Amino acid sequence: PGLFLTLEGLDGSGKTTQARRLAAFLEAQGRPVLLTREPGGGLPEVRSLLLTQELSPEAEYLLFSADRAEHVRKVILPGLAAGKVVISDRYLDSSLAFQGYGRGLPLPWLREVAREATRGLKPRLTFLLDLPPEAALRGLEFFRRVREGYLALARAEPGRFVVLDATLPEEEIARAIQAHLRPLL
Amino acid sequence: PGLFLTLEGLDGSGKTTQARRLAAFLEAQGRPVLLTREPGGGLPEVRSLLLTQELSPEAEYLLFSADRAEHVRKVILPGLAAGKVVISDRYLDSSLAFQGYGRGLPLPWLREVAREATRGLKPRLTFLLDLPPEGLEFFRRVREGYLALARAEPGRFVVLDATLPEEEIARAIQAHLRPLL
Ligand SMILES: [Mg+2]
Ligand SMILES: [Mg+2]
Ligand SMILES: [Mg+2]
Ligand SMILES: [Mg+2]
Ligand SMILES: [Mg+2]
Ligand SMILES: [Mg+2]
Ligand SMILES: [Mg+2]
Ligand SMILES: [Mg+2]
């Protein structure tokens, strides 16, 4: 038991919708599931703080890392230990795309920080809902750096990333996630 | 140039009292000074997050580091660039002693996190007010941890007996500084 999955992409890429549909799919199959998300699954106040405040990228990354540290320890690892499929809407790859490719932080430092923040926990599969910023349902150069950063991450770890066309019908996307998922159960 | 100084120790060691007196002493010597402190110097709200019940040592450190990162960029480096004496009541060594020696986090990771957080900025001198720790086992660890950090960097740390009268401590800080004036 225990299966750790994540969803990634730009805000408005369909992640919550696809996390919900994946939950329901797994509920329909009798498989215990836990939905969670970042930011805020570890330290809710990190999410609400950063709604109205803009910090250096380093400080932003470090707040998200503290939230992720609590999130992994109090939510994700306990859920996995109970044998659940734990699905996180955003995880480490979010910081790497947004604070790294987006705001310019060096990836090897981000990962060194993450190593103890996440206790080395990595998803078995990560679904990237890929689209241009203009297609997001909810400046443009920044968001394009993020989109490309995600695609770069996916190219480096083709054993973990599944890249999906986020502009396809939500049902069609969900059925694609289910086919990629079927061999792992 | 600008001069970066820190004060360290357990809570109740007098390090805040000495930070305040040093600032006034330099400020009455005409030298422009910036008095600041951690936690709160970079992200004043960090104080709320740090009080979270059952916070993991990793998360606690990462919170202090977030404040520290903002502190260095927005307050300390600009102060130093203006040629001020910048005095910080607590800096990185507080995390090394409390979250490393106290809560058990590995020092090399703490330092690697710190290297971008702080942008490598080290105090020229750090005044450690050494107070006997009287849970107690945790404060013994922290107290001894601080002494170990001082032993490792004997040019940077000035270890002072925190039970001496306050004005004697102030005079001993002043004497260590006079060669940088
Ligand atoms: Mg991920
Ligand atoms: Mg992290
Ligand atoms: Mg730090
Ligand atoms: Mg210090
Ligand atoms: Mg500090
Ligand atoms: Mg190191
Ligand atoms: Mg001590
Ligand atoms: Mg040292």
Supply the angle between the helices B166-177 and B15-27 in degrees, to the nearest 10. Answer: 50
The domain made up of B1-181 is a member of CATH 3.40.50.720: no
Measure in Å the smallest separation between the Cα of A39 and chain B Cα atoms. Answer: 14
Strand bridging mode B3-9 / B85-89 = parallel
Tell me how crowded residue A27 is: count the other CB atoms within 10 A of its CB: 11
Query: DSSP secondary structure string, A129-168?
Result: EE--GGG----HHHHHHHHHHHHHHHHH-TTTEEEEETTS
Which residues neighbour B181 within 8 Å (Cβ) at sequence distance 6 or greater?
B29, B31
**DSSP SS3 for B86:** strand
Q: Which of A48, A50, A63, A105 to substitute to test the interface with B, most B CBs within 10 Å?
A: A63
Fold of A1-185: Rossmann fold (3.40.50)
Say if residue A125 is exposed, middle or buried (CB neighbours under 10 Å; 0-12, 13-18, 19+). middle
d(CA A91, CA A104): 18
Residue type, A50: L
DSSP B125: E
Q: How many CA atoms lie within 13 A of B108 on its CB side?
A: 2
Is B112 within 8 Å of A116 (Cβ atoms)? no
Q: Is A88 annotated as a binding residue?
A: no
CA distances (Å), origin A26, targets A5, A20, A23, B53, B71: 12, 10, 5, 33, 46
Strand bridging mode A3-8 / A85-89 = parallel
Q: Give the domain ranges of chain A.
A: 1-185
Cα dihedral sign, B7-B11-B14-B17: positive
CB contact under 8 A, B59 and A69: yes
CB contact under 8 A, A66 and B59: yes
DSSP B74: I
- Residue B50 sits at φ, ψ, to 5 deg, of -70, -25
DSSP B179: G
Residue type, B158: V
Which residues of chain B approach chain A closer than 8 Å at the C-beta?
42-43, 45, 48-49, 52, 54-56, 58-60, 62-63, 65-67, 69-70, 73-74, 105-106, 109, 112-113, 115-117
Best CA proximity match to A5, nearest among A181, A183, A134, A182:
A181
Report CA(B3)–ligand 6 centroid distance (Å). 25
- Experimental technique for the deposited model: X-ray
